[PDB]
Symmetry: D2
């Protein structure tokens, strides 16, 4: 039948099971509900989507922990967002987010973020706003790491054009890992639907990204060394991520990934709404921070 034709990019946060890998620390709750310093891990990637201008977001978690994500985040209305929830019964891979979120996505552009990925740096807002406005094809970010063999790895020719993607290569072609933030057009769900599980039994995001690469529709932007991309893969790196955020925040007196703040700066909530969000947290440093935001100009 006939369709008609007349900002809308939707977001997805994958906040499912980290299996048994960080057990026993994660036996009683999801990794993405563990705090990084002063706030739940999931505030960080949520803030990343918000900085990209995305207000309609699906959170994918396990059946066991969806209610706790719901208690924490609600339907998003407090922060000028709309948050929806979906469950992932079995951790069958990151590309399953698109099958799980098919109805949520509809006919729109989308972005996927890993619920345990934290980014920090300058003009991040601008770096994200950019990729979001590129409507067709896919956009990813490559970042120089010490251990590229743990990641999807991008190979570049001498001109600096991406020419290949390999998932966890034993002999990486570069030290450039693909980060856990992905922007996609309307082709992604069909590409995902045609994926066959890898030898590990999982539906691989690198296969989605390779599909765009083969079509000549993959933009790979370098996220330079002056950005911090932390993930919380080990107990040791989770501790480092906490110390990192604590050092920045205690130095600056400004928070990284405060959603109330980001919504306020985006004009998604007003001063009066922000004041209401501060009232219940007024006795701790978090509510006090929100209060101070109403009476200060921050450039």
């Amino acid at each position: 039948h006939h369709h008609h034709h007349h900002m809308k990019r939707k977001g997805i946060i994958l906040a499912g099971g980290s299996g048994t890998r960080l057990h026993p620390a994660t036996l009683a709750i999801s990794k993405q509900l563990l705090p990084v310093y002063d706030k739940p891990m999931i505030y960080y990637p949520l803030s990343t989507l918000m900085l990209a201008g995305i207000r309609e977001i699906l959170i994918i978690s396990t059946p066991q922990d969806t209610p706790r994500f719901q208690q924490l985040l609600g339907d998003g209305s407090n922060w000028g967002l709309d948050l929806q929830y979906a469950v992932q019964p079995s951790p069958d891979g990151l590309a399953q987010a698109f099958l799980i979120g098919e109805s949520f996505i509809g006919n729109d552009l989308s972005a996927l973020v890993l619920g345990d990925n934290l980014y920090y740096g300058h003009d991040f807002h601008e770096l994200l706003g950019s990729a979001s406005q590129r409507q067709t094809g896919a956009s990813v970010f490559a970042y120089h790491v010490l251990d590229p063999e743990r990641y999807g790895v991008v190979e570049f020719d001498q001109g600096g054009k991406a020419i290949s993607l390999e998932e966890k290569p034993l002999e990486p072609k570069s030290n450039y890992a693909v980060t856990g933030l992905y922007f996609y057009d309307q082709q992604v769900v069909d590409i995902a639907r045609d994926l066959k599980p890898s030898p590990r039994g999982e539906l691989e995001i690198t296969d989605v990204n390779r599909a765009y690469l083969e079509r000549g529709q993959l933009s790979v932007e370098i996220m330079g060394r002056g950005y911090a991309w932390l993930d919380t893969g080990t107990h040791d790196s989770l501790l480092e991520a906490g110390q990192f955020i604590a050092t920045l925040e205690n130095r600056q007196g400004l928070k990284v990934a405060c959603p109330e703040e980001i919504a306020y700066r985006q004009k998604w909530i007003d001063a009066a709404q922000l004041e209401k969000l501060a009232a219940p947290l007024a006795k701790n440093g978090y509510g006090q921070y929100l209060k101070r935001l109403l009476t200060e100009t921050v450039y």
Copy 2:
């Protein structure tokens, strides 16, 4: 007589929100294990195997999920709820039937202890069949705690809960040993000016009869609580620095049960199987074949 143990793992209010909005503090990790493994380990090192875990209505089921009935670790665990955070002394009313006619010990669910001959420092408090024993520890900010005053001869003469003008820098730690008198003392407590049933009031009751032993926990011991986001990060880094230097874990309950002969080599072997692919299971398997002094 036998001594039963109680871990109070109740609500920290809104103090660490939003980090703790979703889940209680004592279910969160300190480095590589849930915070509550640490006080549980403290009780186990005092030789206590019958333990009641008290937490909020919402999270008691989740402590139950995490720890089970304890039989996998040669423990006997029971659970109870504290409907509202109305004071630490409520532990003895909530746990009155659990305690029965036995000796007891209470540990706070967010207290972490590290040091040498702990097994021995606890055993000597555990051995007193009469009176109460507590530990005093020199801190920078005594006003946050129950504060003990000593006379010139080193005798404890007063306790004040969160004084505006502390008499010393010696705070009472969150580990308490009691005789058969504590339930009856807790039953006669009146709420304090802050609307709480105070553990310090209990301790003062023993002090007034000359039945409070106040042992000094020396500077060569580490007492950490997880009261702020900053100190929480400090506790994790501390445990990480010790464990990665030594190749030995602090407060691994499976290891402690095994060393106490509460489980045998074959039970530990079974416990190691689920986490065989990660560091924790690998650690437990290694405990089967290594002599550690």
Copy 3:
């Protein structure tokens, strides 16, 4: 007499005494020779000047420690720089750098950096290159901090124009501290010469900066929250600075403030020279890093 008229901006690092403040840790050596993680503190501000394109640099230290700075840094030729040395017998204030360095500066533009100031962030190269190219007036950077009362503080009108500078105000007009990096034109030495000591007995850089402000020649650029400006004011912040750098470097496998690297990327030294600098450090991670730089493209 008649003068004639036909990149040349010179740099100065103040690396003098921190008094007794960090004693006893600084009894046996200068604070600016203490390592921050894996390299001496002074590598960081030196790298900052290098990133600004400055190759001619004066290091001001105490008589006691100048030889150790000389042993460490030499005359700069190894790194495509020229380094000169001057002593500050008594810690009489930061603005004394211009009287001490008067002959070094000559008729040129200049930049002053504090030897204990560390900066990290994206397009820092570009942010510095910018200020260096502004030839007339002065350029400074303002950064939101938790404790502005410890610093020179800048006040802005509602339009965002700087209107006042106050040195360590008990009641700061904003949370914007002036950072320890300063770019000056040819007027600075005369302004410094006319300074009278403050009540603390010191020649204040904020008085120099106010002089430019009163003339309408002070540019104050915001260094945003996605940049890290760390100083090493306390034992606690020195520890945090070390952990910060260690987390970035171990994540990325790239160093912050490696002068050999920066000189190589600036074309001030070639591959063969870099190879020679790596030979003596070949057994440790530092020399190994320098070696890897010859065989890798880093964007």
Copy 4:
């Protein structure tokens, strides 16, 4: 008999360059004090007051500048040089005349110890008038150290220096107590395959005569060395976490001398005056008026 002490604070080569290019590692800070305060404090806690400090030619004058003749702290300090890093056992040749006919103890200038009843753990090694005493400690990477093998009954039967295939995870720490035999044993040592005079060879010489006491330093003690940039940062954070929690310092030599009665309240008062405006002087002044148990 009296026991003299030696701190070996010599060169770490190019291993931590460029951090240590300008100055030796043991002059750098661990948190708030120079690294060498920590082993000095260890000797002082073992009751040792006559101490020889051995370092590189370049930096001995700077240890002399930092520490003086020790009389301000009720110590008797002397200095000597190790012209080249030719093995720890060189300490006893360099210090032969210093030692004379007395008992001795050697500590490495970059070893940091923390734990309870250290004063007591050292005093019991200090009391042996015959033989040698060392401490073994469970580590993750024993191949970096002198490694001790035990039989089934817990007896030390072998030592290997940096084995490719360690017999256990028990490393010998950098603190050694010796009787009058050590100089003569060191004098007969031959350089090892690595061109070093080995402390492990000295220790094996005592072991062969059944005169090596190998005490276990338990897991409740922290032994830190500052061998890598990473571990250096871990040592500082560890000391910071303890000191800021307790309001008490680890390895403050002025305090240790005062508690040992080597200086009096009036001497400490004078020592506090120079740094009165910072935390360290404020700490020392506070020690005059506070009972710390």
